[PDB]
Amino acid sequence: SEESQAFQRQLTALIGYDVTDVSNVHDDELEFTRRGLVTPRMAEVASRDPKLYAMHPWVTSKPLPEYLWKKIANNCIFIVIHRSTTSQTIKVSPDDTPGAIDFVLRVCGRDEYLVGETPIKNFQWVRHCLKNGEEIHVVLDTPPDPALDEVRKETVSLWDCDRKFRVKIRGIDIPVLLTVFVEANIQHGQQVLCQRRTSPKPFTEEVLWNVWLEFSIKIKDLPKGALLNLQIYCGKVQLLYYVNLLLIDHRFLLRRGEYVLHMWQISSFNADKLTSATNPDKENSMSISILLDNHPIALPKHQEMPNQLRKQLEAIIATDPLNPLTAEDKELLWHFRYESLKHPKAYPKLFSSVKWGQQEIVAKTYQLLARREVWDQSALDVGLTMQLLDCNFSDENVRAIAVQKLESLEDDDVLHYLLQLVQAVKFEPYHDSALARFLLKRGLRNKRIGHFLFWFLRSEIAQSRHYQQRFAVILEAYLRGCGTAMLHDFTQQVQVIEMLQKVTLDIKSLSDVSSQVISQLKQKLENLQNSQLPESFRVPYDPGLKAGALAIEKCKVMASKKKPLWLEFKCADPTALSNETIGIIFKHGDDLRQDMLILQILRIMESIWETESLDLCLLPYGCISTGDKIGMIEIVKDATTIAKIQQSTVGNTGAFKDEVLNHWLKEKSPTEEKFQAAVERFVYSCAGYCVATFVLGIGDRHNDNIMITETGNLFHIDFGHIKERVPFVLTPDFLFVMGTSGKKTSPHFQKFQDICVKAYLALRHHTNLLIILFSMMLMTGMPQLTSKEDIEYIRDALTVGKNEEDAKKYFLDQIEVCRDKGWTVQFNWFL
Numbered sequence: 001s002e003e004s005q006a007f008q009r010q011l012t013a014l015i016g017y018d019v020t021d022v023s024n025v026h027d028d029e030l031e032f033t034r035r036g037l038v039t040p041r042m043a044e045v046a047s048r049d050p051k052l053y054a055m056h057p058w059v060t061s062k063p064l065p066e067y068l069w070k071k072i073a074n075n076c077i078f079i080v081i082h083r084s085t086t087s088q089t090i091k092v093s094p095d096d097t098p099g100a101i102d103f104v105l106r107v108c109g110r111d112e113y114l115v116g117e118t119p120i121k122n123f124q125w126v127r128h129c130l131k132n133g134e135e136i137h138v139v140l141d142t143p144p145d146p147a148l149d150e151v152r153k154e155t156v157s158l159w160d161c162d163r164k165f166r167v168k169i170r171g172i173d174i175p176v177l178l179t180v181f182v183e184a185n186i187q188h189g190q191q192v193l194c195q196r197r198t199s200p201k202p203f204t205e206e207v208l209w210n211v212w213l214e215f216s217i218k219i220k221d222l223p224k225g226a227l228l229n230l231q232i233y234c235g236k237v238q239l240l241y242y243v244n245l246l247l248i249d250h251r252f253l254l255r256r257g258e259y260v261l262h263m264w265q266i267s268s269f270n271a272d273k274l275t276s277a278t279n280p281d282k283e284n285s286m287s288i289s290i291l292l293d294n295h296p297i298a299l300p301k302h303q304e305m306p307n308q309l310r311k312q313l314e315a316i317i318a319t320d321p322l323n324p325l326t327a328e329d330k331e332l333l334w335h336f337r338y339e340s341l342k343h344p345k346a347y348p349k350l351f352s353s354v355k356w357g358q359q360e361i362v363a364k365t366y367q368l369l370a371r372r373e374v375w376d377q378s379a380l381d382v383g384l385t386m387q388l389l390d391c392n393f394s395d396e397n398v399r400a401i402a403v404q405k406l407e408s409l410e411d412d413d414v415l416h417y418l419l420q421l422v423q424a425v426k427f428e429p430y431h432d433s434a435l436a437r438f439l440l441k442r443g444l445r446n447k448r449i450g451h452f453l454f455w456f457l458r459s460e461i462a463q464s465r466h467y468q469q470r471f472a473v474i475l476e477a478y479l480r481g482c483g484t485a486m487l488h489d490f491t492q493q494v495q496v497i498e499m500l501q502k503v504t505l506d507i508k509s510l511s512d513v514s515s516q517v518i519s520q521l522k523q524k525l526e527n528l529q530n531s532q533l534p535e536s537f538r539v540p541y542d543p544g545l546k547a548g549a550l551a552i553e554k555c556k557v558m559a560s561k562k563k564p565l566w567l568e569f570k571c572a573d574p575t576a577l578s579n580e581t582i583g584i585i586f587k588h589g590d591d592l593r594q595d596m597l598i599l600q601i602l603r604i605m606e607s608i609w610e611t612e613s614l615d616l617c618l619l620p621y622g623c624i625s626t627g628d629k630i631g632m633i634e635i636v637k638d639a640t641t642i643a644k645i646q647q648s649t650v651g652n653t654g655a656f657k658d659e660v661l662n663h664w665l666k667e668k669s670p671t672e673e674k675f676q677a678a679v680e681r682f683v684y685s686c687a688g689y690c691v692a693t694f695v696l697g698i699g700d701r702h703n704d705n706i707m708i709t710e711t712g713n714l715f716h717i718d719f720g721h722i723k724e725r726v727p728f729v730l731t732p733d734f735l736f737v738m739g740t741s742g743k744k745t746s747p748h749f750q751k752f753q754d755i756c757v758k759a760y761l762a763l764r765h766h767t768n769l770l771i772i773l774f775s776m777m778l779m780t781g782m783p784q785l786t787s788k789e790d791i792e793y794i795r796d797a798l799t800v801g802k803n804e805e806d807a808k809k810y811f812l813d814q815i816e817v818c819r820d821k822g823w824t825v826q827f828n829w830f831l
């Protein structure tokens with residue numbers, strides 16, 4: 001009580017939503033989940049190694065790629081250890097442990113340690129340094145005190161009921177406003193098990209029906225996770241409002257009695273359509289009034305084919321995740337249940353062949369899951385696992401076997417999928433789920449995962465009404481186990497970004513170009529420096545870096561329609577070898593969640609390419625959405641837009657020219673050596689992004705949204721946005737670097753083409769994994785009333801089904817479409 005109340009307030013501020021609030025609930029599920037997440041929290045806290053926890057070595061067991069091997073001769077890497085003033089340099093082999101070479105080796109500039117029983121080759125920092133052509137540097141330091149990571153102390157059976165399910169629609173009530181009807185769907189996954197409508201009435205501000213809607217499905221046939229989905233159409237109709245209610249609640253009980261549900265408006269696959277959350281805006285939202293009536297009813301717990309058929313089944317099984325199953329296929333999968341079970345890849349389809357509205361079939365399915373010996377022993381396929389976690393699956397036991405598989409992921413692989421795994425919580429029927437606990441116990445076991453877990457959850461709590469409650473309960477559970485140092489750390493991070501938000505927002509209210517504002521910005525910054533800015537905060541998109549003093553001199557504001565703040569900070573770590581500022585852009589008016597998702601997919605593309613010894617030098621800069629249309633972005637040093645390079649050597653904004661970009665590169669390359677290093681990095685980076693963006697359907701890019709660094713690294717930006725078209729941006733100037741003009745070939749255009757194809761085929765070897773991630777991004781991140789149309793773009797993009805010849809040839813057509821078109825799309829912007 002004495003501490004519990006100030007502590008829960010610490011938690012409310014950190015979360016930015018009161019988890020102990022019952023203003024907007026009709027049951028106690030949220031609270032039940034708070035209580036329920038205590039066990040797995042306490043287990044993970046109990047079993048975590050204090051030493052490795054506090055230092056969080058960021059390691060991988062991946063093989064050191066072929067391209068990074070070729071950046072070391074005679075098998076000897078150099079690590080320069082720092083005493084105080086002087087620094088000695090030790091020669092080592094990739095295999096050497098940090099033991100091998102009271103103290104602990106910490107990275108200079110960063111809270112990042114080279115510790116534990118892993119070879120230096122396998123540390124991500126060492127792998128990072130090797131990549132960029134940088135040398136490894138560490139300070140002999142005391143291991144940080146584990147003490148600092150201390151944690152504060154803390155019926156009638158359903159299957160004996162043959163009645164048909166029914167629900168009364170008393171009426172709807174809207175304070176401020178055609179005819180209208182209520183449709184009531186019993187859903188499972190996306191599957192509509194059974195549907196009923198009311199008679200149409202006139203759409204007045206209050207509409208009463210008093211009718212029983214009788215469903216064809218029996219109570220015993222209600223599956224756990226079935227949503228009563230209530231929707232309101234008007235009229236050739238149009239969906240105006242929706243709400244959902246779980247028919248079987250957290251305790252397995254059948255949901256009974258009176259409900260006044262506040263509904264959501266509409267602006268069609270969308271995670272938002274699935275939430276059990278009610279609209280909290282009661283004074284405006286549309287309400288529906290229902291009665292579920294029947295004593296409490298509880299769901300129990302569940303204590304050699306023909307050649308052409310097998311082949312027909314092997315075809316079905318092999319098809320892609322977005323390939324529709326006909327009933328004919330469903331019937332075949334289910335009849336051959338046990339054959340289908342021998343193939344982990346058949347699982348998604350197989351469990352999409354189950355009649356979830358039929359209780360004996362569901363029991364047979366669970367008997368099937370009891371026997372998943374092959375599943376259990378198979379190699380982890382994340383593509384296949386993620387499929388089982390999407391909106392097509394609402395059965396806990398099905399979904400649980402996906403999570404079961406995610407357990408074998410090393411901490412490096414979690415980070416790779418964390419955002420998308422945080423987003424897949426939107427598909428869980430219930431607040432407490434095996435997926436939320438996986439996230440939780442994995443966040444609690446590794447500070448790096450823990451860090452981003454916080455921010456990914458906070459991103460959603462701050463802007464999703466459809467899921468802030470759930471995600472909030474989950475984040476609290478993390479916060480109650482992360483440890484005092486992280487709490488304090490988070491408190492610092494939140495305070496800063498809330499101060500910087502103010503200034504960004506306040507300046508945007510004082511607004512295409514600025515005069516009096518440039519010192520009105522610097523006024524407010526100077527204020528915070530000594531008003532309440534902490535001397536150091538952690539960089540949310542890069543937790544290894546603490547930022548400190550503001551470089552007011554360097555801070556500016558874009559001459560844009562959204563006045564983002566360009567901010568710079570001195571690094572708080574005295575032992576940083578450089579004094580490069582830390583560069584954060586703060587922006588309002590774009591939805592940076594969409595950016596988070598594209599940047600993360602890009603990172604996944606890189607690690608795929610890594611497994612085929614392909615580096616394409618992408619630049620997935622950091623980006624965290626922190627609130628309602630607001631967030632932060634990593635400033636990439638020594639970087640300029642392609643647009644501004646054109647507007648400098650050509651000047652006027654009308655025309656364009658080819659030489660300028662190669663000319664700008666030579667000017668930024670001191671020696672010829674580094675100029676050729678750039679044209680190479682440019683061919684790769686151009687390749688990486690041409691492939692990356694064609695697949696994701698975002699290649700047609702205004703070229704003030706493509707940037708290049710002074711070492712020739714091309715990189716796309718500002719993905720939150722999205723006259724004839726172009727599959728991607730490969731403009732005459734890009735081609736001029738590659739020594740080509742109109743129609744020609746060169747030792748670099750042949751390489752670029754070469755690379756693009758390898759890059760492209762390497763993505764297709766993960767057709768499914770990409771199809772699911774893309775599928776999920778759109779549903780959870782791009783509320784664009786996403787259709788089958790939109791999702792099925794990536795299939796065509798990855799030319800599914802085609803052999804590698806036709807695929808190779810397809811992409812080279814695209815390369816040429818761009819050649820043929822030149823400046824047409826770019827010039828067409830200004831009109």
Ligand SMILES: C[C@H](Nc1ncnc2[nH]cnc12)c1cc2ccc(F)cc2nc1-c1ccccn1
Pocket residue numbers: 556557558559564565566585621633634635636637639640641644704707717718
């Ligand atoms: C468009 C460009 N974008 C980025 N620049 C650097 N790092 C980044 N990371 C993601 N986007 C950028 C940019 C953004 C700005 C935002 C605020 C501001 F005050 C100034 C900005 N300036 C640039 C910019 C434009 C042309 C050349 C260099 N920087």
